[PDB]
Amino acid sequence: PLEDQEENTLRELRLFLRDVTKRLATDKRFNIFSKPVDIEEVSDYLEVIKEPMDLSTVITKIDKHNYLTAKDFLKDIDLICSNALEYNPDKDPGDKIIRHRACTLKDTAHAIIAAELDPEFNKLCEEIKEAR
């Protein structure tokens, strides 16, 4: 029914985003991004990083209906990668691995969205998001 179109579209989007996020969170390369940085083990993390983000929080935000478009979702993936580059110094090999992995996460997420979402469906999501 036409009156159910908005809800049906967003449900489809959320299902897709939840699948994408699960694919990222279970990828061994991105394990360090799968849960919030432990603010007690990394005692200076919140001093440096104003808006923490991680893949488990992205799942929650999907379920809280925070994302109306794939671009909305990608902003938080980009934040996860941005946080890693802002926080971690480029000193030791462990730092370099995390920083590289953050960029790989970003590239991988953007590539999945570009490959698996119909541009026409995205216009529909934008139209819905533009009506609210």
């Binding site: 990394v42 200076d44 971690n88 030791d92």
Partner: peptide
Amino acid sequence: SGRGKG
């Protein structure tokens, strides 16, 4: 940047 995680 912070101290890092190493």
